[PDB]
Design an enzyme around this catalytic site. Structure first.
Site, PDB file in Angstrom:
ATOM      1  N   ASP A  89       0.818  -1.199   0.000  1.00  4.12           N
ATOM      2  CA  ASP A  89       0.000   0.000   0.000  1.00  4.12           C
ATOM      3  C   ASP A  89       0.859   1.258   0.000  1.00  4.12           C
ATOM      4  OD1 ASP A  89      -1.925   1.957   0.425  1.00  4.12           O
ATOM      5  OD2 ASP A  89      -2.877   0.922   2.128  1.00  4.12           O
ATOM      6  N   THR A  90       1.145   1.779  -1.184  1.00  8.98           N
ATOM      7  CA  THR A  90       1.993   2.965  -1.284  1.00  8.98           C
ATOM      8  C   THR A  90       1.349   4.223  -0.720  1.00  8.98           C
ATOM      9  OG1 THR A  90       1.312   3.384  -3.570  1.00  8.98           O
ATOM     10  CG2 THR A  90       3.321   2.070  -3.234  1.00  8.98           C
ATOM     11  N   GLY A  91       0.027   4.226  -0.549  1.00  8.12           N
ATOM     12  CA  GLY A  91      -0.670   5.337   0.070  1.00  8.12           C
ATOM     13  C   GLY A  91      -0.757   5.278   1.579  1.00  8.12           C
TER      14      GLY A  91
HETATM   15  C1  LIG Z   1      -8.618  -1.036   2.099  1.00  6.01           C
HETATM   16  C2  LIG Z   1      -7.189  -0.648   1.769  1.00  6.01           C
HETATM   17  C3  LIG Z   1      -6.829   0.817   2.071  1.00  6.01           C
HETATM   18  C4  LIG Z   1      -7.047   1.170   3.545  1.00  6.01           C
HETATM   19  C5  LIG Z   1      -6.122   0.479   4.527  1.00  6.01           C
HETATM   20  C6  LIG Z   1      -7.632   1.724   1.146  1.00  6.01           C
HETATM   21  N1  LIG Z   1      -7.254   3.154   1.278  1.00  6.01           N
HETATM   22  C7  LIG Z   1      -6.047   3.532   0.515  1.00  6.01           C
HETATM   23  C8  LIG Z   1      -4.867   3.734   1.477  1.00  6.01           C
HETATM   24  O1  LIG Z   1      -3.628   3.826   0.723  1.00  6.01           O
HETATM   25  C9  LIG Z   1      -5.006   4.978   2.354  1.00  6.01           C
HETATM   26  C10 LIG Z   1      -4.882   6.298   1.593  1.00  6.01           C
HETATM   27  C11 LIG Z   1      -4.980   7.500   2.518  1.00  6.01           C
HETATM   28  C12 LIG Z   1      -3.905   8.334   2.814  1.00  6.01           C
HETATM   29  C13 LIG Z   1      -4.051   9.394   3.700  1.00  6.01           C
HETATM   30  C14 LIG Z   1      -5.277   9.649   4.288  1.00  6.01           C
HETATM   31  C15 LIG Z   1      -6.343   8.825   4.003  1.00  6.01           C
HETATM   32  C16 LIG Z   1      -6.202   7.765   3.122  1.00  6.01           C
HETATM   33  N2  LIG Z   1      -3.979   4.912   3.369  1.00  6.01           N
HETATM   34  C17 LIG Z   1      -4.207   4.686   4.652  1.00  6.01           C
HETATM   35  O2  LIG Z   1      -5.254   4.493   5.230  1.00  6.01           O
HETATM   36  O3  LIG Z   1      -2.987   4.699   5.387  1.00  6.01           O
HETATM   37  C18 LIG Z   1      -3.081   4.746   6.806  1.00  6.01           C
HETATM   38  C19 LIG Z   1      -1.902   3.907   7.255  1.00  6.01           C
HETATM   39  O4  LIG Z   1      -0.785   4.791   7.140  1.00  6.01           O
HETATM   40  C20 LIG Z   1      -1.202   6.128   7.398  1.00  6.01           C
HETATM   41  O5  LIG Z   1      -0.677   6.964   6.386  1.00  6.01           O
HETATM   42  C21 LIG Z   1      -1.734   7.467   5.574  1.00  6.01           C
HETATM   43  C22 LIG Z   1      -3.020   7.313   6.388  1.00  6.01           C
HETATM   44  C23 LIG Z   1      -2.720   6.128   7.300  1.00  6.01           C
HETATM   45  S1  LIG Z   1      -8.512   4.167   1.218  1.00  6.01           S
HETATM   46  O6  LIG Z   1      -7.979   5.501   1.172  1.00  6.01           O
HETATM   47  O7  LIG Z   1      -9.294   3.865   2.394  1.00  6.01           O
HETATM   48  C24 LIG Z   1      -9.403   3.905  -0.122  1.00  6.01           C
HETATM   49  C25 LIG Z   1     -10.479   2.995  -0.188  1.00  6.01           C
HETATM   50  C26 LIG Z   1     -11.189   2.794  -1.394  1.00  6.01           C
HETATM   51  C27 LIG Z   1     -10.795   3.502  -2.539  1.00  6.01           C
HETATM   52  N3  LIG Z   1     -11.432   3.351  -3.741  1.00  6.01           N
HETATM   53  C28 LIG Z   1      -9.751   4.402  -2.484  1.00  6.01           C
HETATM   54  C29 LIG Z   1      -9.075   4.603  -1.284  1.00  6.01           C
END
Ligand SMILES: CCC(CC)CN(C[C@@H](O)[C@H](Cc1ccccc1)NC(=O)O[C@H]1CO[C@H]2OCC[C@H]21)S(=O)(=O)c1ccc(N)cc1
Lengths: 99, 99
Positions: B25-27
């Site tokens: 998960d690069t995000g």
């Molecule tokens: C179901 C799999 C993941 C959640 C686990 C899905 N996410 C993408 C994810 O990259 C998200 C993207 C994201 C980034 C920043 C803020 C909200 C979401 N990152 C995220 O939640 O990361 C968390 C863990 O590390 C921390 O750094 C960033 C937030 C924390 S998401 O944002 O909820 C998402 C869900 C559905 C769609 N279509 C698009 C995005």
């Protein structure tokens, strides 16, 4: 190009007359952009992540330019804290993970 | 390997002798795993995702083998929708985005 992951993989995208910074996000199935009043038909959807769900509007066949690469497809719009380019468009610009 | 993005980039990880599937998960800044037991001291922490904030347990210096590549770093345990490998460990295994 090659993007390392020491920092968030933010890149410039364009959607109409708005340039935005967005995450190249392999963990997102579909592209989600911060609230914006795009033209055209849409359908409601709820998407889930850490913390629960948010409500978004699903627009189809929306052209987006990502670092100069052309893409066109589904764009979700809603109260996300960050613009997210998900896999639906990452594949269109040729993006892979490599290690 | 090179991993394309037409499917979710799910890989097998080994953590505490257990095999689990996790999403590259690069995000995600952080690595977050679903409820599980890990040994040693942990710290209460909170993190925010697309849908709000959750409580997690923060474990430091945990070994994880990710698709055969070794990392040792911080693992957060709590109510994530799926096990995710974030940038803190993707950097350790030399993962980059390429297009
Ligand atoms: C179901 C799999 C993941 C959640 C686990 C899905 N996410 C993408 C994810 O990259 C998200 C993207 C994201 C980034 C920043 C803020 C909200 C979401 N990152 C995220 O939640 O990361 C968390 C863990 O590390 C921390 O750094 C960033 C937030 C924390 S998401 O944002 O909820 C998402 C869900 C559905 C769609 N279509 C698009 C995005």
């Amino acid at each position: 190009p090659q993007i390392t992951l020491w920092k968030r993989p933010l890149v410039t995208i364009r959607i109409g007359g708005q340039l935005k910074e967005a995450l190249l996000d392999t963990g997102a199935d579909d592209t989600v952009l911060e609230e914006m009043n795009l033209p055209g038909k849409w359908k409601p959807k709820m998407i889930g992540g850490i913390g629960g769900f948010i409500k978004v509007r699903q627009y189809d066949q929306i052209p987006i330019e990502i670092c100069g690469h052309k893409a066109i497809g589904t764009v979700l719009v809603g109260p996300t804290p960050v613009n997210i380019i998900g896999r639906n468009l990452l594949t269109q610009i040729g993006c892979t993970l490599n290690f």
